[PDB]
From Swiss-Prot:
Site (Important for Cav2.1/CACNA1A calcium channel binding): Y13
Keywords: Amidation, Calcium channel impairing toxin, Disulfide bond, Ion channel impairing toxin, Knottin, Neurotoxin, Presynaptic neurotoxin, Secreted, Toxin, Voltage-gated calcium channel impairing toxin
Major location (coarse): secreted
Name this protein carries in UniProt: Omega-conotoxin MVIIC
Family: Belongs to the conotoxin O1 superfamily.
The organism's place on the tree of life at top rank: Eukaryota
Gene Ontology terms: cellular component: extracellular region; host cell presynaptic membrane
Location in the cell: Secreted
SUPFAM superfamilies given in the database record: omega toxin-like
Tissue: Expressed by the venom duct.
Uses in industry and biotechnology: Could be used as a diagnostic tool for the autoimmune disease Lambert-Eaton myasthenic syndrome.
Length: 26
């Protein structure tokens, strides 16, 4: 998982935060 503000994809909530951004950051 990608930590807060890390280059994720909310498409599948790729973050450790559990809620990625539409901007592509966690």
């Amino acid at each position: 998982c990608k930590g807060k503000g890390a280059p994720c994809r909310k498409t599948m909530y790729d973050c450790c935060s559990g809620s990625c951004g539409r901007r592509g950051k966690c």
